[PDB]
Motif scaffolding. Structure first.
Motif, PDB file in Angstrom:
ATOM      1  N   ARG A 110       0.720  -1.087   0.262  1.00  0.00           N
ATOM      2  CA  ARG A 110      -0.441   0.007  -0.211  1.00  0.00           C
ATOM      3  C   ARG A 110       0.901   1.566  -0.004  1.00  0.00           C
ATOM      4  N   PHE A 111       1.876   1.176   0.939  1.00  0.00           N
ATOM      5  CA  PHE A 111       3.226   1.712   1.066  1.00  0.00           C
ATOM      6  C   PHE A 111       4.231   2.015   0.310  1.00  0.00           C
ATOM      7  N   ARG A 112       4.715   2.662  -1.391  1.00  0.00           N
ATOM      8  CA  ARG A 112       6.124   2.669  -1.855  1.00  0.00           C
ATOM      9  C   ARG A 112       7.314   2.835  -0.705  1.00  0.00           C
ATOM     10  N   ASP A 113       7.289   4.284  -0.868  1.00  0.00           N
ATOM     11  CA  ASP A 113       8.746   4.547  -0.100  1.00  0.00           C
ATOM     12  C   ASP A 113       8.536   4.880   1.757  1.00  0.00           C
ATOM     13  N   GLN A 114       9.860   4.899   1.535  1.00  0.00           N
ATOM     14  CA  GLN A 114       9.918   4.398   3.023  1.00  0.00           C
ATOM     15  C   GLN A 114       9.376   5.154   4.520  1.00  0.00           C
ATOM     16  N   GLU A 115       9.982   7.002   3.657  1.00  0.00           N
ATOM     17  CA  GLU A 115       8.844   7.431   4.460  1.00  0.00           C
ATOM     18  C   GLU A 115       8.196   7.733   4.418  1.00  0.00           C
ATOM     19  N   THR A 116       6.736   7.238   3.939  1.00  0.00           N
ATOM     20  CA  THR A 116       5.350   6.796   3.973  1.00  0.00           C
ATOM     21  C   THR A 116       5.024   5.823   4.919  1.00  0.00           C
ATOM     22  N   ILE A 121       3.190   3.798  10.299  1.00  0.00           N
ATOM     23  CA  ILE A 121       4.362   2.690  11.431  1.00  0.00           C
ATOM     24  C   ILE A 121       3.532   3.766  12.641  1.00  0.00           C
ATOM     25  N   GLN A 122       3.696   5.771  13.051  1.00  0.00           N
ATOM     26  CA  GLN A 122       3.675   6.007  13.654  1.00  0.00           C
ATOM     27  C   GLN A 122       2.204   6.322  14.586  1.00  0.00           C
ATOM     28  N   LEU A 123       1.446   6.689  13.042  1.00  0.00           N
ATOM     29  CA  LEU A 123      -0.015   6.708  13.587  1.00  0.00           C
ATOM     30  C   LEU A 123      -0.518   5.856  13.721  1.00  0.00           C
ATOM     31  N   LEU A 168      -8.381   5.346   9.255  1.00  0.00           N
ATOM     32  CA  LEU A 168      -8.757   5.108   7.957  1.00  0.00           C
ATOM     33  C   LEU A 168      -9.072   5.977   7.353  1.00  0.00           C
ATOM     34  N   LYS A 169      -9.360   7.191   7.259  1.00  0.00           N
ATOM     35  CA  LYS A 169      -8.725   8.464   6.126  1.00  0.00           C
ATOM     36  C   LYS A 169      -7.957   8.603   6.307  1.00  0.00           C
ATOM     37  N   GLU A 170      -6.878   9.212   7.173  1.00  0.00           N
ATOM     38  CA  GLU A 170      -5.035   9.574   7.192  1.00  0.00           C
ATOM     39  C   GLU A 170      -4.449   8.556   6.751  1.00  0.00           C
ATOM     40  N   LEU A 171      -4.563   6.833   6.263  1.00  0.00           N
ATOM     41  CA  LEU A 171      -4.423   5.561   6.043  1.00  0.00           C
ATOM     42  C   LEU A 171      -4.323   6.423   4.129  1.00  0.00           C
ATOM     43  N   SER A 172      -5.465   5.878   4.364  1.00  0.00           N
ATOM     44  CA  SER A 172      -5.740   6.631   2.397  1.00  0.00           C
ATOM     45  C   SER A 172      -4.788   7.397   1.793  1.00  0.00           C
ATOM     46  N   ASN A 173      -5.190   8.449   2.888  1.00  0.00           N
ATOM     47  CA  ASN A 173      -4.571   9.808   2.181  1.00  0.00           C
ATOM     48  C   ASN A 173      -2.256   8.983   2.199  1.00  0.00           C
ATOM     49  N   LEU A 174      -2.327   8.589   3.129  1.00  0.00           N
ATOM     50  CA  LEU A 174      -0.992   7.979   2.891  1.00  0.00           C
ATOM     51  C   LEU A 174      -0.684   6.782   1.708  1.00  0.00           C
ATOM     52  N   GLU A 175      -1.139   6.194   1.457  1.00  0.00           N
ATOM     53  CA  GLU A 175      -1.260   5.070  -0.165  1.00  0.00           C
ATOM     54  C   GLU A 175      -0.804   5.982  -0.517  1.00  0.00           C
ATOM     55  N   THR A 176       1.062   5.097  -1.352  1.00  0.00           N
ATOM     56  CA  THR A 176       1.437   5.879  -2.524  1.00  0.00           C
ATOM     57  C   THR A 176       0.832   5.897  -4.125  1.00  0.00           C
ATOM     58  N   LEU A 177       0.321   6.751  -4.601  1.00  0.00           N
ATOM     59  CA  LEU A 177      -0.443   7.045  -6.659  1.00  0.00           C
ATOM     60  C   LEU A 177       0.638   5.905  -6.897  1.00  0.00           C
ATOM     61  N   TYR A 178       0.255   4.583  -6.993  1.00  0.00           N
ATOM     62  CA  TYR A 178       1.090   3.482  -7.838  1.00  0.00           C
ATOM     63  C   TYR A 178       1.311   4.348  -9.652  1.00  0.00           C
TER      64      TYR A 178
ATOM     65  N   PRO C   1       7.840   9.159  10.060  1.00  0.00           N
ATOM     66  CA  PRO C   1       8.792   7.939   9.538  1.00  0.00           C
ATOM     67  C   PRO C   1       8.888   8.527   7.824  1.00  0.00           C
ATOM     68  N   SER C   2       9.503   9.805   7.679  1.00  0.00           N
ATOM     69  CA  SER C   2       9.978  11.037   6.723  1.00  0.00           C
ATOM     70  C   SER C   2      10.867  10.501   6.616  1.00  0.00           C
ATOM     71  N   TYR C   3      12.213  10.477   7.572  1.00  0.00           N
ATOM     72  CA  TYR C   3      13.154  10.472   8.055  1.00  0.00           C
ATOM     73  C   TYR C   3      13.523   9.733   8.476  1.00  0.00           C
ATOM     74  N   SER C   4      13.526  10.315   9.760  1.00  0.00           N
ATOM     75  CA  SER C   4      14.414  10.146  10.830  1.00  0.00           C
ATOM     76  C   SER C   4      14.141  11.282  12.098  1.00  0.00           C
ATOM     77  N   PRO C   5      14.698  12.389  11.853  1.00  0.00           N
ATOM     78  CA  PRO C   5      15.383  13.912  13.371  1.00  0.00           C
ATOM     79  C   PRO C   5      14.912  14.574  11.996  1.00  0.00           C
ATOM     80  N   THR C   6      15.050  15.503  12.488  1.00  0.00           N
ATOM     81  CA  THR C   6      14.059  16.990  11.438  1.00  0.00           C
ATOM     82  C   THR C   6      15.324  17.866  12.146  1.00  0.00           C
TER      83      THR C   6
END
Lengths: 178, 84, 25, 56, 171, 103
Positions: A110-116, A121-123, A168-178, C1-6
């Protein structure tokens, strides 16, 4: 000879109870919440949403290719070819399981980039929900808080309908646009 | 539990039994086409090869010496005195 | 989790954003 | 600093650009006309659609 | 689901390998034995993590034999499916009995009977498909399944699953 | 060899591509005049414009075609030791003949 774990329990003569595995969050003895790492420290269960998993394996095989060349000194459809190439380099090749796994992961993440995957993982890990749910919430795309609570039945009273629906809303917003 | 090297108290000398077992084991391994850690100066009998490896202390084996309580002291064949 | 620290950089020595003209009474 | 909006030395080549256009103080009626004219340029750009069909 | 598990495997190395490329051969043999492996206790042991830090420890001597035995402590990504788990997957095979769905390393099979009544088998198609009033399920289609139960079968784990209940089926 | 022909066909397709550039460059500066309201060369704008399209479509067919040809050529079907060994003689022998009588 097969693989053992950090779970040391002494089953002396007394064979059974081997009480069923269901999402009543009753997974194995092995997939218990209180795990122990090789450093003896009690550490919590590590559950991955297929994307968090995709990245982990990719990372590991990438780092392995490094040591393999070191010790030798003296767009999704595009990710599939790129990954199938890394597997030819590091993996045993007989391991077809990893090949299918990596393909499935690439096609179902559902999420391509590590940042995503970092925000996901936080949320999620702030809900107090057990690693299994926290993974299934990351890997199963749900719209109604009922879609979620039906598919992940363990959630039932653990979260507000609105609080889950807000997630569920802020999860859909994170989905990487394939 | 495994006794630290600095706290080992068993004989610094190899027992008759240890030596017989090392020679037996190496000879067995040598005979099962294991890599030989010495120049075979024409040698062909794996026991005579084993004897030679032990003679130059080029045997990569360790004796786990168990104590009646269950603990143990590990000793290298290189470090054990062969007065036998 | 975008990178780590800011990534800090905070700055008051920059070009400038304020002008000045109402100094006179 | 942290609450301030401005433009840098930047605003200046923004003027170089603004003055690079053909306009400035001549007002509304002549300006509305320029808009229709630029729109005509975009319509002559549609001509690109026609030529793209040819590339075929 | 999909876990990271700390595990350890005992390897018995023959003396001929007591050269400097020992750790290298141990780390290698570990990967040969463990990677790809499928157990009941742990599921599919897919990929060994952190190659550069695999703990070899000191190898004990198996007395009458020459060989040394080490307990190679490692950490890996595993896939252990459970009953009640809702999974997404691609159809692989399809017959008059149901359809198999590929979910990463494993196949989950859906019975004609574990689907709604409206979805019916169509043999007269290339490839054979399941047809609903609205839906069509065939070899390439993506489906969301509820695992009804698993069977630990040798070098694999297979499962039965439904698409009858709410929020399941085609995606 | 006679492939040097096919080689030159491609090196010319290369000059065609440097024309895709050269032509669309005018398209850049000419559309510059055009949105500037000065409809002066609007027909000329259209010309060099369908021309950038034309050059790259010709290049596109020409190198695409060349690739098809190479695939077709592919479908179609030490050297040192050989000639050298014998030829030794031929030069030294002919030269030994030359120093013996001449002119």
């Amino acid at each position: 000879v097969s693989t053992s774990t950090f779970q040391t329990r002494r089953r002396r003569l007394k064979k059974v109870e081997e009480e069923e595995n269901a999402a009543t969050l009753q997974l194995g003895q092995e997939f218990q919440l209180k795990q122990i790492n090789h450093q003896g420290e009690e550490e919590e269960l590590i559950a991955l949403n297929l994307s968090e998993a995709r990245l982990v394996i990719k990372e590991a095989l990438v780092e392995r290719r490094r040591a393999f060349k070191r010790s030798q000194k003296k767009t999704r459809e595009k990710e599939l070819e790129s990954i199938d190439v890394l597997l030819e380099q590091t993996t045993g090749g007989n391991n077809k399981d990893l090949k299918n796994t990596m393909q499935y992961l690439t096609n179902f993440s559902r999420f391509r980039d590590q940042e995503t995957v970092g925000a996901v993982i936080q949320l999620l890990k702030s809900t107090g929900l057990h690693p299994f749910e926290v993974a299934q919430l990351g890997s199963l795309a749900c719209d109604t808080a009922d879609e979620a609570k039906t598919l992940i039945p363990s959630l039932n009273n653990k979260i507000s309908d609105d609080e889950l629906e807000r997630i569920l809303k802020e999860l859909s917003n994170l989905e990487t646009l394939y | 539990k495994a006794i630290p090297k600095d706290q080992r108290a068993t004989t610094p000398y190899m027992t008759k039994y240890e030596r017989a077992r090392i020679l037996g084991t190496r000879a067995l391994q040598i005979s099962m086409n294991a890599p030989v850690f010495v120049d075979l100066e024409g040698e062909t009998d794996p026991l005579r090869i084993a004897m030679k490896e032990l003679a130059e202390k080029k045997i990569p084996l360790v004796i786990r010496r168990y104590l009646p309580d269950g603990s143990f002291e590990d000793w290298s064949v290189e470090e054990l005195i062969v007065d036998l | 989790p975008s990178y780590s620290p800011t990534s800090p950089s905070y700055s008051p020595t920059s070009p400038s954003y304020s002008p000045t003209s109402p100094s006179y009474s | 600093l942290l609450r301030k909006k401005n433009i840098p030395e930047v605003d200046e080549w923004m003027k170089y650009v603004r003055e690079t256009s053909g306009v400035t103080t001549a007002l509304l009626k002549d300006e509305e006309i320029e808009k229709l004219l630029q729109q005509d340029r975009e319509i002559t750009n549609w001509a690109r659609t026609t030529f793209r069909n040819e590339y075929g | 689901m999909f876990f990271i598990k700390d595990l350890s495997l005992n390897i018995t190395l023959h003396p001929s390998f007591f050269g400097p490329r020992m750790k290298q051969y141990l780390k290698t043999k570990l990967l040969e034995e463990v990677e790809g492996s499928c157990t009941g206790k742990f599921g599919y042991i897919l990929c060994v993590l952190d190659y550069d830090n695999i703990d070899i420890q000191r190898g004990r001597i198996l007395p009458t034999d020459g060989s040394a035995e080490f307990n190679v402590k490692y950490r890996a990504v595993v896939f252990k499916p459970f009953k009640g788990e809702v999974v997404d997957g691609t159809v692989v095979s399809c017959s008059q009995h149901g359809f198999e769905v590929q979910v990463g390393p494993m196949k989950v099979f859906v019975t004609k009977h574990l689907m709604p009544q409206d979805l019916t088998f169509n043999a007269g198609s290339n490839p054979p498909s399941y047809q609903s009033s609205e839906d069509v399920i065939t070899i390439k289609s993506r489906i969301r399944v509820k695992i009804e139960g698993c069977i630990s079968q040798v070098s694999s784990i297979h499962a039965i699953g439904s698409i009858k209940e709410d929020y399941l089926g085609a995606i | 060899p006679y492939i040097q022909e096919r080689l030159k066909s491609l090196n010319d397709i290369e000059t065609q591509l440097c024309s895709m550039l050269q032509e669309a460059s005018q398209v850049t500066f000419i559309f510059g005049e055009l949105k500037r309201g000065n409809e002066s060369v609007k027909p000329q704008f259209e010309n060099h414009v369908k021309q950038f399209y034309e050059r790259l479509d010709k290049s596109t067919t020409q190198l695409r075609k060349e690739i098809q040809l190479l695939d077709e050529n592919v479908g179609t079907r030490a050297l040192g030791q050989d000639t050298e060994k014998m030829e030794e003689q031929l030069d030294l022998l002919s030269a030994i003949l030359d120093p013996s009588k001449s002119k």
